[PDB]
Design a protein around this ligand. Sequence first.
Ligand SMILES: *[C@@H]1O[C@H](CO)[C@@H](O[C@@H]2O[C@H](CO)[C@@H](O[C@@H]3O[C@H](CO)[C@@H](O)[C@H](O)[C@@H]3O)[C@H](O)[C@H]2NC(C)=O)[C@H](O)[C@H]1NC(C)=O
Ligand SMILES: *[C@@H]1O[C@H](CO)[C@@H](O[C@@H]2O[C@H](CO)[C@@H](O)[C@H](O)[C@H]2NC(C)=O)[C@H](O)[C@H]1NC(C)=O
Ligand SMILES: *[C@@H]1O[C@H](CO)[C@@H](O[C@@H]2O[C@H](CO)[C@@H](O)[C@H](O)[C@H]2NC(C)=O)[C@H](O)[C@H]1NC(C)=O
Ligand SMILES: *[C@@H]1O[C@H](CO)[C@@H](O[C@@H]2O[C@H](CO)[C@@H](O)[C@H](O)[C@H]2NC(C)=O)[C@H](O)[C@H]1NC(C)=O
Ligand SMILES: *[C@@H]1O[C@H](CO)[C@@H](O[C@@H]2O[C@H](CO)[C@@H](O)[C@H](O)[C@H]2NC(C)=O)[C@H](O)[C@H]1NC(C)=O
Ligand SMILES: *[C@@H]1O[C@H](CO)[C@@H](O[C@@H]2O[C@H](CO)[C@@H](O)[C@H](O)[C@H]2NC(C)=O)[C@H](O)[C@H]1NC(C)=O
Ligand SMILES: *[C@@H]1O[C@H](CO)[C@@H](O)[C@H](O)[C@H]1NC(C)=O
Ligand SMILES: *[C@@H]1O[C@H](CO)[C@@H](O)[C@H](O)[C@H]1NC(C)=O
Ligand SMILES: *[C@@H]1O[C@H](CO)[C@@H](O)[C@H](O)[C@H]1NC(C)=O
Ligand SMILES: *[C@@H]1O[C@H](CO)[C@@H](O)[C@H](O)[C@H]1NC(C)=O
Ligand SMILES: *[C@@H]1O[C@H](CO)[C@@H](O)[C@H](O)[C@H]1NC(C)=O
Ligand SMILES: *[C@@H]1O[C@H](CO)[C@@H](O)[C@H](O)[C@H]1NC(C)=O
Lengths: 171, 176, 172, 53, 85, 84, 317, 319, 316
Amino acid sequence: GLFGAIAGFIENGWEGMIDGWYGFRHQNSEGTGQAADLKSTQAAIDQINGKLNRVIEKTNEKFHQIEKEFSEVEGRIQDLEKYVEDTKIDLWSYNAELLVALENQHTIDLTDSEMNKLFEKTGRQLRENAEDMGNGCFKIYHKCDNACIESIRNGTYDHDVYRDEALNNRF
Amino acid sequence: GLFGAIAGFIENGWEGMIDGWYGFRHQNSEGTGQAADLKSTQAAIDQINGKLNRVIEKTNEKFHQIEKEFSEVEGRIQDLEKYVEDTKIDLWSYNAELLVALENQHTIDLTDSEMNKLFEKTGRQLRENAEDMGNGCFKIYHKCDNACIESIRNGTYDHDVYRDEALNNRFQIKGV
Amino acid sequence: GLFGAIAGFIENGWEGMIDGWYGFRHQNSEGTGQAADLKSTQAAIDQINGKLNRVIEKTNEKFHQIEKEFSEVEGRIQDLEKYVEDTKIDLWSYNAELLVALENQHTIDLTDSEMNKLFEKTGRQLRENAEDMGNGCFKIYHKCDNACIESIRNGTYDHDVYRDEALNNRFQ
Amino acid sequence: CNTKYQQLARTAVAIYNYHEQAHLTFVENYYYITLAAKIGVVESAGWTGVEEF
Amino acid sequence: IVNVPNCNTTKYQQLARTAVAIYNYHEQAHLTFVENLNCKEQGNYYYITLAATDDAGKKAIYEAKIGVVESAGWTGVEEFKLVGS
Amino acid sequence: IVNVPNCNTTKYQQLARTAVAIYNYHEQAHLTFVENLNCKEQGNYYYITLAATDDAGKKAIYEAKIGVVESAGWTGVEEFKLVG
Amino acid sequence: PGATLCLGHHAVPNGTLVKTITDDQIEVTNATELVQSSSTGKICNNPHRILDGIDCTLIDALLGDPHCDVFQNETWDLFVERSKAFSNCYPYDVPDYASLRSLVASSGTLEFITEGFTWTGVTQNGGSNACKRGPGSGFFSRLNWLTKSGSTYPVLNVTMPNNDNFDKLYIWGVHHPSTNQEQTSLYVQASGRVTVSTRRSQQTIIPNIGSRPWVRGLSSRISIYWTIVKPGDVLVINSNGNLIAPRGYFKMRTGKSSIMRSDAPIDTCISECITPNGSIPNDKPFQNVNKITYGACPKYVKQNTLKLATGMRNVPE
Amino acid sequence: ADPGATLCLGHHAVPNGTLVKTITDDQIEVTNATELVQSSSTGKICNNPHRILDGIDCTLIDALLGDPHCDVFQNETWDLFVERSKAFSNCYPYDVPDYASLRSLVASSGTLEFITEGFTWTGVTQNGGSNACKRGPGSGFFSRLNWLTKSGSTYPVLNVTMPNNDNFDKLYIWGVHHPSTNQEQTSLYVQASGRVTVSTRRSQQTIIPNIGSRPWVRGLSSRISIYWTIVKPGDVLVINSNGNLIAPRGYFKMRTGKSSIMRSDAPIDTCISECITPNGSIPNDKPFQNVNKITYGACPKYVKQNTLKLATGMRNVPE
Amino acid sequence: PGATLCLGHHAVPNGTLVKTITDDQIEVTNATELVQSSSTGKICNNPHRILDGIDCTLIDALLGDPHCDVFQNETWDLFVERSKAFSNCYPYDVPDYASLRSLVASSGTLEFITEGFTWTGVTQNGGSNACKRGPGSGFFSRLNWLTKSGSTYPVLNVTMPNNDNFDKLYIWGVHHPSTNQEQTSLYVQASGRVTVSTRRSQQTIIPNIGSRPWVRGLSSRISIYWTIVKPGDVLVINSNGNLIAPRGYFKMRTGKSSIMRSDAPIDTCISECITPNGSIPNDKPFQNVNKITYGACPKYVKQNTLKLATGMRNVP
Ligand SMILES: *[C@@H]1O[C@H](CO)[C@@H](O[C@@H]2O[C@H](CO)[C@@H](O[C@@H]3O[C@H](CO)[C@@H](O)[C@H](O)[C@@H]3O)[C@H](O)[C@H]2NC(C)=O)[C@H](O)[C@H]1NC(C)=O
Ligand SMILES: *[C@@H]1O[C@H](CO)[C@@H](O[C@@H]2O[C@H](CO)[C@@H](O)[C@H](O)[C@H]2NC(C)=O)[C@H](O)[C@H]1NC(C)=O
Ligand SMILES: *[C@@H]1O[C@H](CO)[C@@H](O[C@@H]2O[C@H](CO)[C@@H](O)[C@H](O)[C@H]2NC(C)=O)[C@H](O)[C@H]1NC(C)=O
Ligand SMILES: *[C@@H]1O[C@H](CO)[C@@H](O[C@@H]2O[C@H](CO)[C@@H](O)[C@H](O)[C@H]2NC(C)=O)[C@H](O)[C@H]1NC(C)=O
Ligand SMILES: *[C@@H]1O[C@H](CO)[C@@H](O[C@@H]2O[C@H](CO)[C@@H](O)[C@H](O)[C@H]2NC(C)=O)[C@H](O)[C@H]1NC(C)=O
Ligand SMILES: *[C@@H]1O[C@H](CO)[C@@H](O[C@@H]2O[C@H](CO)[C@@H](O)[C@H](O)[C@H]2NC(C)=O)[C@H](O)[C@H]1NC(C)=O
Ligand SMILES: *[C@@H]1O[C@H](CO)[C@@H](O)[C@H](O)[C@H]1NC(C)=O
Ligand SMILES: *[C@@H]1O[C@H](CO)[C@@H](O)[C@H](O)[C@H]1NC(C)=O
Ligand SMILES: *[C@@H]1O[C@H](CO)[C@@H](O)[C@H](O)[C@H]1NC(C)=O
Ligand SMILES: *[C@@H]1O[C@H](CO)[C@@H](O)[C@H](O)[C@H]1NC(C)=O
Ligand SMILES: *[C@@H]1O[C@H](CO)[C@@H](O)[C@H](O)[C@H]1NC(C)=O
Ligand SMILES: *[C@@H]1O[C@H](CO)[C@@H](O)[C@H](O)[C@H]1NC(C)=O
């Protein structure tokens, strides 16, 4: 993707995460855990649903048209009737092919973007208390129990509480 | 947006900034202030103007065509004349709908990108003299008067001048 | 571009780099050097080739159609024959114009993205041993001979080996 | 003479019930039939008509 | 017993003016109708003798043969001959 | 007025050769024109007596009636009868 | 020590391949099909009023072929013509058949109003054994075969004003006998003529006497023509022979009616989109079943599948 | 110690945002947008820079034939001929088979320039008129047609020829008269059945008149049927008739170009506008329009949507 | 004393300008052209079977104009009509010429099969000096000019059923004399009539008598008509004068054949795409050469150039 997270600096996906599209895995003194992130998951789902509803919106209702199959040879007028319908079909076939190609390229990029945004947002929470390991994980340089991990996942983590401990361990 | 700045880590916009699209607000020893950034504003304006001029470029001139309203029932030839015009209108209606949807999605993303570019460029100027507060603001760890803020906004800020002062303030920890 | 690397915080390109699309220039104790990066070059080339092959894919074969030039004035049916062909040409001309404009905008953005990805990847290798100078270059705060520069370019650079040396130069 | 001939007569009575909006019921180049309750045929054209009734 | 038409009626004056106009159109002349002298209806045809002056003010006498076929709405000047002054 | 015509003039030979070709086409025969013997014009018609051989070289005498309607550009062989 | 926090995204074991601008096949977690490529094979009878022609074409029901009598005064949203249809009346042709079929199909009704035409000097209601209605002879229910009365066929000069607020469709015909004596036996005159006119238009047909192929016993033919009389106009029929006269007019309407050729059976279901292959769902924006459709339908495209990605790139372990 | 400094990056916003459509959002607020669909009109047709010819009471065909109340249109030219719904015919009742094609080709030609030619009609009476087609207080006829009838008691076989020695195409308009009775037929043309044959080296047309009663139009049951023939440079016009010929007086000069015809009741005004619709002229700054699918000139393309807003600013996020 | 590591990208001294969504022109390192705008000017004779009409239109080769005899039983994928073509037989016209030319071109063959028509009571094989075949008079090879025999022209009434499994195309005509004397001299009856019918269709043509302009010395004309007989149907021809009779049928086919007007010479080369200007390669998806094409061709567009970016932004 354009942002380098999905199929990028994140090596692979998590088949074990079945309750969200993006989330956190942690390791601390009390063990390991996993939690999906709701806001980033919902942002990707809302964009794709909106794109999908615009695409499948029923907007074509036609009634009496032109004939398109013929049992006898007629020449000029039938040549034109066939050419008109063949021209229409090719233009709509082109529209449909380009549409799914543009939409899919954008869907892969927007979901890549949401992953990168969540990563950058998390690193901004940790400030000088953590370092980017380059593989989607942060090394946190202070004791961080379950309540501390939960404060990162719900966005209330105050970096200043742990800064003195973290700066000392880092340097 | 795709980049997470506008309607993202920047909480909202500034209605009071009426002389540019992007800019700086500061708080230092001399007070508070506000200044628009010219280069980033002009880059967004130039891209949208270029996109807009391509969309409204007058490119359609037709003269004698086919009839499109009919006062009598005729059957085959009139069926085809109406079908041809209905086919054309639907394809152009689709083109017009798709064009504005793609353009608008891209306009929102390019203006988001310009905001993110200006933020990243500012943080690269400050180097180790400042920290990203996570809401679009930098905490600058030294005395930085109006002339100092001006040097950041016009790209002449020399980080080595303040690095010793800034590193000292940044790495104050608790002593026991 | 959307990502700010090419024609952005990287001031210009290298005409002297003839063996790849992206690469490294370094200066260390042993002198200066230049080397292309293969993965990022190949990733951009693969995307453009895939896009190019998709566009030039032969997909149109027509045989007996309608007449399109006329030597006599006939009126109604000839008006429609001309209008049908004129309508088709304008719709395909629009398709062709929009296609190249979208493709080119995306090609410029994807190549900008590949430059930015390689930059972000390199800074993540160096961790706390280097600083971003803001122009696409990293200042590395330890002795890094040719073997050390190569370890960065082939992805084996172990930052812990130099961290103590680098932190000392960086902050004192 | 009350055969063919019976279908020709009922055909004449039905055409009469259409033309005059009456409701009769049959009892018993040209055919002249006297019935109780004038037909032409041209076999090359397949035409059959009741000229008089 | 004999019924003689009035040559100064609207119908006959208009037939003569039409006859003068057709002559002017066909011969690129400019006669002006003055008055009818005699007139006769026989079958589909009217026979009118009229006076007409030219741009020089000279009056002359002309004989017109005018056909009218009512079912076709047709009126035609078949003859327009100068007779004298 | 007595006229002794040359029945082997270019005009008359072409009228006869055309007649032989029409006969060969219509009857799937293969006569070959040799010469005209007598010739006569009467109204819209030429009456020509000609000799023609078959593939075995057997000569026979034929009488042809050829019509011409110039205003229509029409030329037609109405009769082509073996005499002996 | 410290702690480790890893950001990540989900994945599935069973991905789906999709097309993008750059990749011909790339695996995502989910996709939805955009091309309707299947049908039940059956035409649903709701919500469009379907009318099965069975053995009858729309024109045969229009003219009044006896085995098409059941369709009198019928209406439809969609008329379905079966390939097994046949004619079983007087042999005929329709110059501009496709247009008459089209305009009647678009009107969506066969409502017929008998009008009091007066035919003085001719005998009416001619029939044929090529067009049996029951045991005996018959004719098209909506047409009146006029022949000589006594020893003469006078000039017919009838008028019919249109004092209504709708268009009237008149269907009339011209009889082409096969021999000269057949022409004179029926219509006296050596050459007939039919001139039907309004204030807007005139149509003159001269019959054509000659032998045609044997069809249901007959070498003769009838040519069918039509005339629309707008409100405030008047119909005028003029003939000195060979007139197959109308008995009235068909009321004309505008709307969404049409006609379709299909051999698919009618079923008891609900579907807005109809194709000759049967009804198809319209939840997808494109379809690959048939370019012929009727109703709220997906647009026809050449592709039999187009997968729209509905999830991120799928990167399993 | 010192408090240091804070430097905040931001972007502008407005209190009057505009909703626009995107790929993902049906409505999203941006700071500014511009309309791409022209949906209004002044209701008037601007008379510049296109030459507008107002037909008023006259259709193009009636001005072509020379209906007396359409005399003012003789030799007229136009870029756009405007036909009003109040137009009416007031000459001999007629019809034109393929009326639409003749109206199209004349409208596309853009001129009614007529050139009289010296036809010689030996043995017939010329210039027949009608009280159904008055020019002045008396009877008249189409100015460009010549009603031929018998002279004396005969109507000869007409055989006239007009070669085209010029380097342009000639348009000949001619007609055939359909009487109501046999007496009417023989009174005008002697022969019991007429015939009109008009031919070139490349084409021929033969029309047989029809005798019978049509509905009354302006007192008449008879009709004239209008036909046309185009003669290319180097070809020749031949007219052959033994009755019922409504003869041409000459040809119309043929041109190719940008001219056309439009049906409208919009008044014509003194303004400038490149684009014309039946509803009136519309500006052409926007690439799309919703006013009418019938347009003439440099016009936005017709679309079904009545609005399509193009975003011209960033996302609007008020305080 | 440390090290510096700079990230960069390449650049070229010969960039190419391309269009984008935002920029009318912007410089990239490389681009490829998407609009084919040139042609060799020659029509390649492979892989399509090209039939060069030279002096003959398709209709004249169909009817059998003598100088078009060489095209008898010919087949083609593309028939090429030259602007120098000319007719040199009896002056004629074809109502719906465009339709007949179209359906024969789409059929792709002139395969003619002679049938045993019996014309009792008339003179067959009428010819004309306006249609010489050799030094003598002639006529269209596929038509049969019938005239009176003796002093009578009977009512012709022949029948030809179609028992084969393909469609038959019958070409026939009606003769339009110039004078009444010409009419009665050829056909006795003062007014002719031609009625051609199947079980599904019928056509009756009444000849026209009158003076037309001279074409190759003649004021009379032949009008060409056509009838298709489906398998199981039957052809009936009925006439009492002026019939230009068919000699048989043309075999009808469906397929990929067509016709094109071009003055481009034909050459021994390979090209899938054909235009009146000549063949063009089809590697590019669009072309600006001609809206008339045949085969696997780029789509016609109005633009003469459309450059597709194939490299990054060029910043020297
Ligand atoms: C064939 O029938 C038609 C219709 O019945 C006849 O046409 C009608 O003819 C009468 C008199 O010829 C017309 O009456 C006139 O009407 C005008 C205007 O309303 C009025 O001012 C007159 O005083 C007179 O009453 C009538 O309008 C006309 N109708 C139509 C539809 O044409 C026609 O005459 C018949 N054919 C023959 C040969 O008689
Ligand atoms: C964010 O997470 C923190 C960490 O768990 C939450 O703080 C705890 O909240 C629970 C309430 O369920 C209390 O019982 C604990 O005593 C809290 N612990 C601490 C250290 O404060 C916090 O409530 C969460 N906030 C939100 C908005 O979800
Ligand atoms: C003209 O020819 C047709 C066909 O040869 C004749 O039609 C046949 O007529 C007989 C009885 O007359 C029928 O049994 C056949 O079935 C008919 N065949 C076809 C193909 O129609 C027709 O009779 C002839 N007409 C004349 C006047 O002789
Ligand atoms: C410029 O672009 C062209 C095509 O966009 C490049 O040439 C293509 O290279 C691929 C490599 O796999 C081949 O498959 C194609 O056949 C080549 N096409 C042509 C037309 O050569 C080319 O390498 C690029 N660079 C330069 C300097 O031209
Ligand atoms: C009718 O007029 C045409 C004029 O087109 C006459 O045709 C000319 O006939 C003479 C000999 O009769 C030829 O030399 C000319 O070349 C012909 N002219 C053209 C243009 O073809 C025709 O003869 C006349 N017919 C009658 C019966 O008078
Ligand atoms: C291909 O041929 C066509 C026509 O044979 C050329 O188009 C003509 O170009 C000339 C001069 O530019 C114009 O005067 C004509 O009006 C054009 N005709 C049409 C129908 O447009 C075309 O330029 C040729 N193209 C090439 C590449 O040879
Ligand atoms: C940048 O701002 C500083 C402080 O106001 C000023 O001294 C310097 O000249 C400025 N440079 C530029 C290039 O504007
Ligand atoms: C990477 O480069 C170093 C430096 O020379 C070398 O020793 C090492 O073998 C290389 N490893 C790989 C995997 O390329
Ligand atoms: C995935 O696609 C299927 C089929 O299109 C759909 O039913 C489902 O809602 C989508 N989402 C998930 C999470 O399965
Ligand atoms: C629909 O019917 C047509 C023939 O009418 C056939 O070619 C096509 O394959 C059918 N499609 C399906 C999905 O049955
Ligand atoms: C916003 O766009 C409108 C066009 O709809 C324009 O009139 C106006 O000047 C623009 N305002 C700004 C601030 O760009
Ligand atoms: C234009 O005129 C048409 C036809 O009268 C009408 O349907 C349409 O609403 C009008 N539109 C405008 C914008 O006036």
